[PDB]
Amino acid sequence: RPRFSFSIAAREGKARTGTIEMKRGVIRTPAFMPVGTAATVKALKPETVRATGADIILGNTYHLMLRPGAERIAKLGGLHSFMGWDRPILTDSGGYQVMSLSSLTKQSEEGVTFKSHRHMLSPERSIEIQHLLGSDIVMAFDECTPYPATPSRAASSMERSMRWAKRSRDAFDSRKEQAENAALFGIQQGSVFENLRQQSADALAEIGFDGYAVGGLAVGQGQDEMFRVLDFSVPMLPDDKPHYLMGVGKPDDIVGAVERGIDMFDCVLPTRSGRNGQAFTWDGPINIRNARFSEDLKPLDSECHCAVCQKWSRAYIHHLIRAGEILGAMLMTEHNIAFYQQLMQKIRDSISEGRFSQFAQDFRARYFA
Amino acid sequence: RPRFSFSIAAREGKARTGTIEMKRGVIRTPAFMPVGTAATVKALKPETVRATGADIILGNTYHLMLRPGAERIAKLGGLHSFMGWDRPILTDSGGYQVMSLSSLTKQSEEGVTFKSHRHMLSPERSIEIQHLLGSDIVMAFDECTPYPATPSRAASSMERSMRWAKRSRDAFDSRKEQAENAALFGIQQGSVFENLRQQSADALAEIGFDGYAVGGLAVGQGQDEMFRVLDFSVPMLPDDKPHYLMGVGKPDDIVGAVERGIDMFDCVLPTRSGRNGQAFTWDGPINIRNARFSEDLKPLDSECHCAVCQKWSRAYIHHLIRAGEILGAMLMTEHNIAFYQQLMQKIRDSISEGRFSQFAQDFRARYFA
Ligand SMILES: [Zn+2]
Ligand SMILES: [Zn+2]
């Protein structure tokens, strides 16, 4: 396989289905990426993650740089060998978690220094760490914009992010091993403002990336607003490259995002919320801790083909989660990630068949009945 | 298969190797039983437990009667269907955990009432609950003796336990479905006193059981004392039935116990201590949390054939346990239970081959080097 090749096989409206070919494997799009925080998809062996249908996972640079350390991981052979996942890995830049989880941060035009929940990140250091991890898809380092944000603040942070985009581009390309074997994505910013989103798209396209993320839309916007901004933002991005909506999300958010041209997703909802008792079903989510499930012999979802739904009852998983048993987390997580992968499979097949609009309508009518 | 058939295929000294045939499967002896507390072997799917070589697991009646409830489990189809383990299950009587974990207990000749950490247990109720769970090997309900114990106290509790042994026998036999499909073991008591151990053995043999446990030797005795008491106690039991040492234990305890005629073991050490960072190896245990493992690419044990040692490094498991990641518990637990099963396999093969004395010497010289 090539370093990177995105091909669109079928379209319906703004929706697309296709493949990203990379050295470590093929990624089917639209794609959902299970989140591996600190070198693990919580409560699952990598073989189990693969068994659910995942083609690629996300790694959180911030957490990995703190524990176990980027240089240590490189010394040990890289993230893939360390955790036992040999397919593509997308790593974030670490910039978001600096702002949401670290302390005493100090931001400047060079980058950010911060205290672990003393460290540094910058466009150059972030791209370097992703290299040390052995990332297949590298994310440009940027500066987040909170929501809401004033237009001045949104513009300042977008502008800085585009300067850092160019710095990220240059750092990646100067490292031949990285440039020849990994891909680099740029992140569109601009908060909810169309003019700023357009300026950002133009700046990224001018620099040129392998794929384009829509950043900053999972920091408090509700769905209507997120979709409104996707409506004008995604068409601004190059059509022939992947479109990655960072941090999204709920099944209905995914469906609508794909209707608006998004090709890639990541979210901790299936893993986190599964540990917390929330199970996804085609009839909407349930909280397995509810007493109504204590003697329910049915599987978590009546149609789900995952191993969990083949072998255990709601009653059993209810018991495990109530008792705080690790197997409960394991089974909830496997199911939810398998659900999410079946959703993406239904989305891909329906776009391939020119029936995605119908699928989205049917999905919604039942999920929200 | 029959309800119950124990056959001895080979002997060396007091050691024995053979099989217990039961309706749900064959148990190879000497046997190690992973402990399933509240309907789970912590951090492992039942298929994984089986993959390590386990032929049978233990279920803790006390915990199950509290959560999710014995009657509920029966309504749901029994413990095997509930948790997804279809091979034999041995259930304890719940009496030990009443004494070590419950409060405000009230003991009498009829049984014990107690508060959950309000409930009751008695010979009749304990055998009933084991029935409701669908247990294959049922343990008689008795009264524990602390260590140390005075001879008067030891004798009183032993005597009561033998009265309760007869009550347990009668309750089991009166329930035809249970009597025809499960087995009943009696428990020898007597603290560390030879005369009391002999009286207890005689009383149990007179009543007649399918197998005979040595109780009360994992409550503070060190190894020398435990072995001293096994030296005279195990020969008192019927030779042609299984000998179950409850609550033991460490690898060297198992080896020495088998040298003294024990056929079955259970302990929470491999599972519990694995969650806590202790990994068993042929060169003795290690604590994976120690900084010396942070960049150790070797597997947990150099010879272990488990899946964990095939795929992950010490460095990785060190990271997971330090980070409190569930996968760390999962991998440590799988390894330790696989270690324990490989130990039992080496013990069985060496007895079959008439070289167990040599095996015990070699084992020790390396495990304690
Ligand atoms: Zn499922
Ligand atoms: Zn191993």
XYZ file of C-alpha atoms and ligand atoms in Angstrom:
740
model
C 0.000 0.000 0.000
C 0.887 3.698 -0.434
C 1.666 6.092 2.363
C -1.789 7.599 1.814
C -4.582 7.268 -0.730
C -8.164 8.389 -0.178
C -10.657 7.162 -2.736
C -14.356 7.923 -2.908
C -16.341 5.003 -4.256
C -19.866 6.263 -3.860
C -21.796 9.409 -3.039
C -25.272 10.461 -2.002
C -25.837 14.179 -1.590
C -22.970 15.454 0.522
C -22.347 11.979 1.914
C -19.393 9.876 0.769
C -18.188 6.322 1.247
C -14.746 5.081 0.330
C -11.351 4.026 1.649
C -8.101 5.406 3.010
C -5.192 3.145 2.078
C -2.141 3.410 4.345
C 0.908 1.224 4.921
C -0.606 -0.399 8.037
C -4.009 -1.059 6.530
C -7.211 0.149 4.822
C -9.651 2.451 6.576
C -13.257 2.223 5.476
C -15.063 5.576 5.411
C -17.168 6.875 7.020
C -15.019 5.634 9.894
C -15.423 5.523 13.655
C -12.154 5.490 15.691
C -12.273 3.998 19.200
C -10.202 6.185 21.545
C -7.108 4.641 23.154
C -6.182 7.083 25.904
C -2.922 5.918 27.592
C -2.034 3.173 25.126
C -5.235 1.207 25.630
C -8.797 1.224 24.407
C -10.193 0.987 27.945
C -11.192 -2.567 28.940
C -10.472 -4.206 25.553
C -7.620 -6.168 24.116
C -6.622 -4.878 20.662
C -7.857 -8.163 19.073
C -11.281 -7.406 20.550
C -11.233 -3.862 19.169
C -10.440 -5.303 15.757
C -13.162 -7.933 16.156
C -15.745 -5.182 16.458
C -14.815 -3.903 13.003
C -12.534 -1.003 13.884
C -9.956 -0.221 11.161
C -8.070 2.490 13.114
C -7.862 3.828 16.672
C -7.002 7.202 18.165
C -4.144 7.807 20.576
C -4.094 10.838 22.964
C -0.648 12.475 22.752
C -1.133 14.442 25.980
C -1.685 11.413 28.101
C 1.084 9.366 26.418
C 3.634 12.141 26.847
C 2.881 12.174 30.569
C 2.703 8.404 31.010
C 4.610 6.412 29.935
C 6.546 9.079 28.011
C 7.056 9.586 24.267
C 10.758 8.898 24.282
C 10.176 5.760 26.339
C 7.612 4.494 23.895
C 10.040 5.129 21.018
C 12.769 3.228 22.874
C 10.339 0.343 23.322
C 9.538 0.136 19.628
C 6.721 2.564 19.106
C 3.079 2.711 20.157
C 1.863 -0.065 17.901
C 4.331 -2.630 19.215
C 3.922 -1.381 22.794
C 0.135 -1.830 22.925
C -0.269 -4.603 20.342
C -2.309 -2.827 17.678
C -0.708 -3.167 14.269
C -3.216 -1.230 12.156
C -3.348 2.578 11.620
C -3.290 4.898 14.600
C -4.319 8.579 14.447
C -2.780 10.676 17.219
C -4.213 14.004 18.325
C -1.811 16.830 18.917
C -2.253 16.994 22.684
C -3.338 20.635 22.552
C -6.949 20.111 23.611
C -6.117 18.166 26.767
C -3.483 20.721 27.684
C -6.317 23.174 27.842
C -8.924 20.981 29.481
C -6.876 18.860 31.873
C -3.500 20.526 32.675
C -2.717 23.318 35.104
C -0.787 26.560 35.346
C -0.627 26.754 31.633
C 1.290 29.452 29.873
C 0.365 30.119 26.264
C 2.419 32.091 23.757
C 3.099 32.286 20.037
C 5.816 29.617 20.399
C 3.515 27.141 22.166
C 2.432 26.188 25.662
C 4.087 25.148 28.859
C 2.074 23.333 31.538
C 1.945 21.184 34.621
C 0.905 17.581 34.621
C -2.418 16.687 36.141
C 6.321 20.597 33.979
C 5.959 19.972 30.250
C 5.898 21.744 26.917
C 4.118 21.505 23.628
C 4.555 23.435 20.396
C 3.905 22.668 16.718
C 7.447 21.224 16.454
C 7.431 19.212 19.746
C 3.915 17.900 19.108
C 4.834 16.643 15.644
C 8.021 15.168 17.117
C 6.146 13.326 19.840
C 3.706 11.905 17.299
C 6.750 10.732 15.398
C 8.251 9.112 18.495
C 4.938 7.283 19.000
C 4.973 6.047 15.430
C 1.603 7.648 14.491
C 0.158 6.966 11.047
C -2.084 10.019 10.903
C -0.557 13.071 12.608
C -2.685 16.028 13.677
C -1.379 19.596 13.330
C -0.965 21.355 16.670
C -3.349 24.271 17.152
C -4.980 26.579 19.721
C -8.518 25.739 20.758
C -11.317 28.269 20.893
C -13.881 27.948 23.652
C -17.610 28.097 23.034
C -18.974 30.645 23.087
C -16.197 32.888 21.771
C -16.250 36.484 20.652
C -15.465 37.124 17.015
C -12.191 38.851 17.963
C -10.977 35.890 20.140
C -12.197 33.398 17.545
C -10.261 35.183 14.871
C -7.069 35.537 16.924
C -7.045 31.868 17.853
C -7.871 30.810 14.297
C -5.040 32.980 12.930
C -2.572 31.583 15.400
C -3.765 28.074 14.581
C -3.089 28.674 10.909
C 0.427 29.937 11.620
C 0.924 26.788 13.710
C -0.540 24.753 10.829
C 2.302 25.900 8.596
C 4.815 25.193 11.367
C 3.323 21.726 11.771
C 3.547 21.124 8.027
C 7.176 22.144 7.938
C 8.177 20.077 11.002
C 6.514 16.980 9.526
C 8.083 17.412 6.105
C 11.585 17.992 7.476
C 11.528 14.545 9.069
C 11.886 12.270 6.100
C 10.920 9.028 7.808
C 7.740 10.649 9.042
C 6.962 12.402 5.790
C 7.398 9.235 3.771
C 5.355 6.933 5.934
C 2.706 8.928 7.856
C 0.016 11.434 6.859
C -0.599 14.966 8.231
C -4.084 16.457 8.818
C -4.844 20.174 9.262
C -7.648 21.455 11.521
C -10.209 24.047 10.551
C -11.068 26.549 13.385
C -13.160 29.704 13.359
C -15.671 28.900 16.105
C -19.206 29.234 14.656
C -18.473 32.104 12.260
C -18.699 31.491 8.535
C -16.119 34.110 7.532
C -13.537 32.708 9.919
C -14.252 29.139 8.790
C -13.717 30.173 5.191
C -10.448 31.966 6.008
C -9.279 28.891 7.849
C -10.187 26.487 5.044
C -8.396 28.663 2.535
C -5.270 28.847 4.688
C -5.187 25.099 5.198
C -5.780 24.281 1.517
C -3.020 26.699 0.582
C -0.587 24.897 2.824
C -1.917 21.518 1.727
C -2.687 18.509 3.975
C -3.632 14.854 3.520
C -6.952 15.392 5.315
C -8.866 18.180 6.981
C -10.442 18.125 10.408
C -13.308 20.328 11.573
C -12.132 21.381 15.019
C -13.829 23.207 17.854
C -17.387 21.985 17.449
C -17.564 19.602 20.381
C -17.032 22.144 23.169
C -20.584 22.987 24.155
C -22.518 23.577 20.986
C -25.756 21.663 20.776
C -26.626 19.571 17.728
C -28.617 22.188 15.884
C -25.775 24.678 16.073
C -23.138 22.054 15.258
C -25.070 21.021 12.148
C -25.659 24.661 11.140
C -21.910 25.284 11.170
C -21.153 22.000 9.386
C -23.645 23.022 6.697
C -21.361 25.861 5.472
C -18.028 24.627 6.807
C -17.574 21.239 5.257
C -18.030 22.419 1.661
C -15.138 24.840 2.204
C -12.703 21.991 2.609
C -11.110 20.188 -0.363
C -13.614 17.628 -1.624
C -11.054 14.977 -2.532
C -9.568 14.623 0.963
C -10.985 13.107 4.115
C -13.104 15.295 6.445
C -12.629 14.503 10.153
C -15.077 15.805 12.759
C -13.128 15.728 16.000
C -14.872 14.745 19.203
C -18.232 13.686 17.760
C -20.104 11.775 18.998
C -23.575 10.403 19.623
C -25.056 8.062 16.965
C -27.503 10.728 15.671
C -24.666 13.294 15.520
C -22.695 10.861 13.344
C -25.590 10.249 10.991
C -26.201 13.954 10.508
C -22.511 14.740 10.177
C -22.195 12.130 7.422
C -25.197 13.802 5.729
C -23.054 16.986 5.768
C -19.923 15.397 4.350
C -17.919 14.037 7.248
C -15.795 10.955 6.753
C -14.174 10.326 10.153
C -15.190 10.368 13.822
C -13.802 9.735 17.272
C -15.492 9.977 20.661
C -15.026 8.537 24.165
C -18.838 8.165 24.547
C -19.029 4.416 23.665
C -16.136 3.455 25.942
C -16.609 5.950 28.829
C -20.377 5.859 28.914
C -20.332 2.080 28.584
C -18.181 1.848 31.735
C -20.806 4.057 33.354
C -23.772 1.893 32.427
C -25.047 3.352 29.124
C -25.640 0.757 26.362
C -26.495 1.775 22.805
C -29.377 0.075 21.023
C -31.245 0.612 17.784
C -34.172 1.718 19.911
C -31.973 4.312 21.649
C -29.682 4.118 24.668
C -30.452 2.338 27.899
C -28.917 2.549 31.341
C -28.249 -1.009 32.317
C -28.109 -0.124 35.984
C -31.882 0.561 36.009
C -33.699 -1.935 38.129
C -35.973 -2.782 35.174
C -33.132 -4.866 33.761
C -32.447 -7.045 36.809
C -34.290 -10.084 35.420
C -34.249 -9.190 31.684
C -32.892 -12.189 29.798
C -32.716 -10.313 26.494
C -29.340 -9.232 25.060
C -28.330 -5.569 25.251
C -29.654 -5.082 21.703
C -32.015 -7.474 19.844
C -30.189 -7.268 16.534
C -26.602 -6.619 17.489
C -24.238 -9.379 16.218
C -21.530 -8.732 18.846
C -20.163 -11.523 21.034
C -21.694 -9.902 24.110
C -25.187 -9.969 22.720
C -24.607 -13.547 21.551
C -23.756 -14.817 25.073
C -24.939 -12.662 27.988
C -28.194 -11.145 29.209
C -29.072 -7.668 30.284
C -29.695 -9.202 33.768
C -26.117 -10.390 33.971
C -24.511 -7.182 32.757
C -26.827 -5.224 35.079
C -25.483 -7.291 37.997
C -21.842 -6.802 37.001
C -22.111 -3.031 36.596
C -24.012 -2.662 39.824
C -21.341 -4.712 41.577
C -18.528 -2.698 40.041
C -17.073 -5.773 38.370
C -14.422 -5.298 35.692
C -16.137 -7.823 33.399
C -19.063 -5.410 33.347
C -16.918 -2.642 31.841
C -15.380 -5.120 29.420
C -18.726 -6.348 28.145
C -20.410 -2.932 27.977
C -17.434 -1.526 26.106
C -17.210 -4.348 23.597
C -20.924 -4.017 22.857
C -20.928 -0.255 22.483
C -17.898 -0.196 20.183
C -19.449 -3.029 18.123
C -22.705 -1.044 17.971
C -20.830 1.985 16.700
C -19.045 -0.115 14.064
C -22.342 -1.645 12.893
C -23.716 1.889 12.587
C -20.798 2.871 10.390
C -21.243 -0.294 8.316
C -24.943 0.468 7.782
C -23.987 4.033 6.812
C -21.362 2.860 4.277
C -23.630 0.220 2.734
C -26.552 2.610 2.453
C -24.468 5.276 0.756
C -23.030 2.624 -1.564
C -26.575 1.642 -2.448
C -27.960 5.136 -2.823
C -30.367 4.653 0.076
C -28.632 6.631 2.864
C -31.337 9.282 3.085
C -33.876 6.562 3.789
C -31.508 4.902 6.274
C -31.084 8.179 8.238
C -34.842 8.677 8.401
C -35.527 5.093 9.514
C -32.676 5.152 12.023
C -34.003 8.290 13.617
C -37.608 7.290 13.724
C -36.726 4.163 15.650
C -33.842 5.499 17.790
C -36.044 8.274 19.045
C -39.364 6.397 19.211
C -20.924 -39.046 32.042
C -21.982 -40.122 35.560
C -23.069 -37.797 38.311
C -19.674 -38.394 39.931
C -16.709 -40.694 39.381
C -13.236 -40.137 40.803
C -10.520 -42.321 39.349
C -6.865 -42.412 40.309
C -4.642 -43.159 37.345
C -1.223 -42.780 38.877
C 0.475 -42.376 42.231
C 3.815 -41.336 43.654
C 4.148 -41.502 47.420
C 1.086 -39.784 48.827
C 0.565 -37.883 45.584
C -2.190 -38.831 43.140
C -3.226 -37.849 39.637
C -6.530 -38.740 38.047
C -9.940 -37.454 36.999
C -13.341 -36.515 38.366
C -16.057 -37.226 35.804
C -19.256 -35.202 36.229
C -22.212 -34.447 33.970
C -20.815 -31.030 32.963
C -17.292 -32.222 32.292
C -14.057 -33.926 33.417
C -11.864 -32.438 36.120
C -8.188 -33.288 35.952
C -6.567 -33.797 39.362
C -4.644 -32.308 41.032
C -6.903 -29.392 40.128
C -6.735 -25.646 40.641
C -10.122 -23.814 40.721
C -10.148 -20.108 39.815
C -12.481 -18.266 42.209
C -15.583 -16.599 40.745
C -16.816 -14.336 43.528
C -20.109 -12.662 42.438
C -20.685 -14.695 39.286
C -17.421 -13.705 37.634
C -13.794 -14.717 37.686
C -12.618 -11.117 38.103
C -11.491 -9.506 34.823
C -11.901 -12.616 32.625
C -14.544 -13.870 30.281
C -15.387 -17.536 30.940
C -13.875 -18.502 27.530
C -10.599 -16.982 28.730
C -10.752 -18.920 32.000
C -11.244 -22.091 29.988
C -8.414 -21.123 27.635
C -6.010 -21.130 30.560
C -6.784 -24.793 31.211
C -9.272 -24.520 34.061
C -11.709 -27.470 34.234
C -13.862 -26.089 37.095
C -14.371 -22.812 38.964
C -15.508 -21.935 42.470
C -18.544 -19.815 43.265
C -18.913 -17.956 46.626
C -22.422 -18.618 47.984
C -22.253 -15.731 50.465
C -21.675 -13.119 47.854
C -24.214 -14.597 45.392
C -26.933 -14.764 48.030
C -26.425 -11.061 48.701
C -26.069 -10.005 45.068
C -27.791 -10.845 42.812
C -29.743 -13.279 45.010
C -30.038 -17.078 44.883
C -33.691 -17.154 43.970
C -33.071 -14.587 41.242
C -30.290 -16.650 39.771
C -32.559 -19.720 39.785
C -35.294 -17.731 38.031
C -32.744 -16.689 35.416
C -31.697 -20.251 34.677
C -28.990 -21.006 37.167
C -25.436 -19.795 37.713
C -23.927 -21.501 34.699
C -26.331 -19.925 32.221
C -26.221 -16.580 34.046
C -22.432 -16.170 33.867
C -21.712 -18.243 30.751
C -19.605 -21.045 32.210
C -20.962 -24.435 31.231
C -18.434 -26.695 32.965
C -18.476 -27.833 36.640
C -18.852 -25.276 39.396
C -18.018 -25.969 43.064
C -19.844 -23.661 45.471
C -18.669 -23.034 49.017
C -21.255 -23.040 51.741
C -21.065 -19.331 52.528
C -20.175 -19.993 56.165
C -16.616 -18.667 56.048
C -17.541 -15.287 54.580
C -20.365 -14.942 57.073
C -17.685 -15.030 59.697
C -15.073 -12.916 57.964
C -17.151 -10.327 56.123
C -20.658 -9.992 57.674
C -21.746 -8.095 60.760
C -23.862 -8.488 63.868
C -23.794 -12.186 63.460
C -25.738 -14.463 65.716
C -24.622 -18.076 65.860
C -26.615 -20.978 67.273
C -27.064 -24.712 66.831
C -29.649 -24.071 64.085
C -27.334 -21.803 62.073
C -26.427 -18.144 61.759
C -28.225 -14.917 61.135
C -26.292 -11.872 59.901
C -26.245 -8.480 58.282
C -25.011 -7.838 54.799
C -21.749 -6.014 54.373
C -30.532 -9.256 57.320
C -29.897 -12.809 56.136
C -29.719 -16.376 57.357
C -27.720 -19.481 56.714
C -28.054 -23.002 58.074
C -27.128 -26.466 56.777
C -30.562 -26.685 55.085
C -30.647 -23.115 53.626
C -27.031 -23.338 52.458
C -27.656 -26.597 50.611
C -30.845 -25.081 49.186
C -29.051 -21.997 47.924
C -26.379 -24.137 46.278
C -29.226 -25.986 44.625
C -30.832 -22.754 43.423
C -27.464 -21.778 41.914
C -27.201 -25.097 40.128
C -23.871 -26.097 41.773
C -22.172 -29.301 40.648
C -20.096 -29.816 43.777
C -21.893 -28.714 46.956
C -20.004 -28.025 50.176
C -21.477 -29.017 53.552
C -22.200 -26.035 55.789
C -20.016 -25.902 58.891
C -18.682 -23.656 61.677
C -15.177 -22.305 61.242
C -12.535 -22.430 63.935
C -10.140 -19.520 64.221
C -6.392 -19.948 64.510
C -5.175 -20.235 67.117
C -7.981 -22.047 68.939
C -8.052 -23.730 72.309
C -8.636 -27.460 72.311
C -12.054 -26.985 73.953
C -13.241 -24.427 71.303
C -11.723 -26.512 68.515
C -13.578 -29.542 69.724
C -16.909 -27.751 70.194
C -16.793 -26.242 66.725
C -15.684 -29.529 65.172
C -18.535 -31.382 66.911
C -21.077 -28.857 65.767
C -19.644 -29.029 62.257
C -20.114 -32.781 62.222
C -23.732 -32.478 63.353
C -24.190 -29.935 60.551
C -22.434 -32.363 58.182
C -25.185 -34.905 58.775
C -27.829 -32.197 58.357
C -26.179 -31.156 55.101
C -26.129 -34.759 53.900
C -29.795 -35.210 54.657
C -30.877 -31.911 53.043
C -28.955 -32.772 49.864
C -30.322 -36.298 49.646
C -33.932 -35.232 50.210
C -33.789 -33.101 47.070
C -33.831 -35.677 44.334
C -32.800 -33.415 41.474
C -29.800 -32.288 43.471
C -28.911 -35.734 44.732
C -29.043 -37.233 41.263
C -27.021 -34.617 39.470
C -24.614 -32.903 41.910
C -22.006 -34.144 44.394
C -21.674 -33.333 48.131
C -18.321 -32.805 49.917
C -17.795 -32.929 53.699
C -15.216 -30.758 55.499
C -12.744 -31.995 58.064
C -12.206 -29.561 61.034
C -10.292 -29.985 64.272
C -7.923 -27.011 64.077
C -4.326 -28.300 64.404
C -5.059 -31.166 66.804
C -4.561 -34.725 65.624
C -7.210 -36.278 67.879
C -9.860 -33.841 66.711
C -8.880 -34.335 63.061
C -9.238 -38.078 63.474
C -12.646 -37.742 65.161
C -13.761 -35.494 62.348
C -12.545 -37.817 59.592
C -14.288 -40.740 61.223
C -17.551 -38.819 61.545
C -17.461 -37.713 57.928
C -16.589 -41.175 56.577
C -19.411 -42.640 58.633
C -21.881 -40.271 57.057
C -20.301 -40.731 53.639
C -19.514 -37.986 51.081
C -18.343 -37.790 47.468
C -15.180 -35.927 48.496
C -13.532 -34.634 51.631
C -12.179 -31.162 52.221
C -9.518 -30.215 54.761
C -10.969 -27.054 56.270
C -9.560 -24.465 58.628
C -5.921 -24.471 57.588
C -5.803 -21.186 55.717
C -6.652 -18.881 58.629
C -3.222 -17.852 59.845
C -1.123 -20.965 60.047
C 2.221 -20.684 58.336
C 3.398 -23.301 55.848
C 5.357 -25.433 58.261
C 2.378 -25.806 60.562
C -0.054 -26.327 57.678
C 2.127 -29.118 56.291
C 2.580 -30.670 59.755
C -1.192 -30.946 60.133
C -1.652 -32.212 56.566
C 0.948 -34.891 57.306
C -1.404 -36.683 59.762
C -4.744 -35.350 58.543
C -4.911 -36.353 54.930
C -4.290 -40.062 55.552
C -7.339 -40.078 57.837
C -9.636 -39.350 54.939
C -10.934 -42.072 52.588
C -8.217 -42.762 50.027
C -10.565 -43.367 47.107
C -12.251 -39.947 47.216
C -10.959 -36.518 46.314
C -9.117 -34.462 48.976
C -9.785 -30.706 48.754
C -7.584 -28.216 50.607
C -9.731 -25.117 50.920
C -8.144 -21.706 50.571
C -4.646 -22.773 49.515
C -2.756 -21.140 47.949
C 0.738 -20.112 46.919
C 2.512 -22.271 44.286
C 4.888 -23.844 46.865
C 1.930 -24.565 49.187
C 0.239 -26.421 46.318
C 3.308 -28.482 45.527
C 3.746 -29.526 49.140
C 0.047 -30.181 49.625
C 0.052 -32.489 46.597
C 3.060 -34.264 48.168
C 0.749 -34.859 51.173
C -2.193 -36.170 49.182
C -4.302 -33.204 48.173
C -6.218 -33.307 44.922
C -8.017 -29.944 44.737
C -7.243 -26.280 45.426
C -8.813 -22.854 45.261
C -7.360 -19.462 46.145
C -7.971 -15.802 45.253
C -4.177 -15.158 45.191
C -3.725 -15.407 41.371
C -6.702 -13.167 40.598
C -6.552 -10.700 43.545
C -2.798 -10.396 43.711
C -2.615 -10.111 39.933
C -4.948 -7.086 40.066
C -2.558 -5.706 42.668
C 0.576 -6.107 40.580
C 1.978 -9.528 41.575
C 2.890 -11.796 38.618
C 3.914 -15.419 39.112
C 6.993 -16.740 37.339
C 9.033 -19.917 37.474
C 11.753 -17.841 39.089
C 9.308 -16.670 41.779
C 6.842 -13.789 41.921
C 7.498 -10.275 40.729
C 5.736 -7.002 41.384
C 5.203 -5.499 37.990
C 4.780 -2.037 39.435
C 8.500 -1.918 40.356
C 10.310 0.674 38.350
C 12.812 -1.975 37.193
C 10.186 -3.184 34.733
C 9.427 0.135 33.026
C 11.519 -0.640 29.929
C 11.669 -4.468 30.215
C 10.602 -5.914 26.874
C 10.536 -9.483 28.187
C 7.205 -11.256 28.807
C 5.986 -11.717 32.382
C 7.508 -15.220 32.383
C 10.110 -16.534 29.884
C 8.492 -19.928 29.444
C 4.820 -19.289 30.004
C 2.698 -20.222 26.932
C -0.205 -17.886 27.812
C -1.556 -15.352 25.322
C -0.316 -12.501 27.505
C 3.258 -13.669 27.443
C 2.951 -14.272 23.695
C 1.946 -10.641 22.948
C 2.819 -8.055 25.610
C 5.902 -6.920 27.507
C 6.517 -6.378 31.160
C 6.998 -2.662 30.242
C 3.484 -2.465 28.873
C 1.787 -4.268 31.738
C 3.839 -2.172 34.184
C 2.424 0.965 32.525
C -1.166 -0.295 32.614
C -1.078 -1.291 36.283
C 0.588 1.933 37.280
C -2.073 3.847 35.367
C -4.888 1.854 36.927
C -6.062 0.626 33.539
C -8.557 -2.234 33.411
C -6.564 -3.990 30.670
C -3.776 -4.273 33.228
C -5.968 -6.323 35.577
C -7.210 -8.390 32.654
C -3.726 -9.264 31.456
C -2.225 -9.892 34.903
C -5.147 -12.125 35.801
C -5.055 -14.152 32.608
C -1.324 -14.732 33.055
C -1.501 -15.710 36.702
C -4.377 -18.151 36.201
C -2.543 -19.637 33.183
C 0.602 -19.931 35.324
C -1.350 -21.777 37.986
C -2.844 -24.131 35.384
C 0.600 -24.856 33.902
C 1.795 -25.656 37.424
C -1.025 -28.140 37.855
C -0.275 -29.645 34.437
C 3.404 -30.092 35.340
C 2.319 -31.678 38.638
C -0.070 -34.129 36.910
C 2.433 -35.097 34.211
C 5.233 -35.602 36.708
C 3.120 -37.821 38.932
C 1.981 -39.754 35.859
C 5.623 -40.272 34.978
C 6.837 -41.133 38.451
C 9.076 -38.067 38.589
C 7.059 -35.736 40.869
C 9.596 -35.801 43.690
C 12.229 -34.527 41.285
C 9.800 -31.939 39.891
C 9.073 -30.558 43.404
C 12.779 -30.273 44.162
C 13.586 -28.558 40.852
C 10.582 -26.252 41.125
C 11.629 -25.118 44.555
C 15.270 -24.653 43.819
C 14.438 -22.296 40.987
C 11.354 -20.562 42.457
C 13.315 -19.656 45.531
C 16.716 -19.006 43.922
Zn -23.997 -6.256 21.175
Zn 1.968 -15.858 30.780
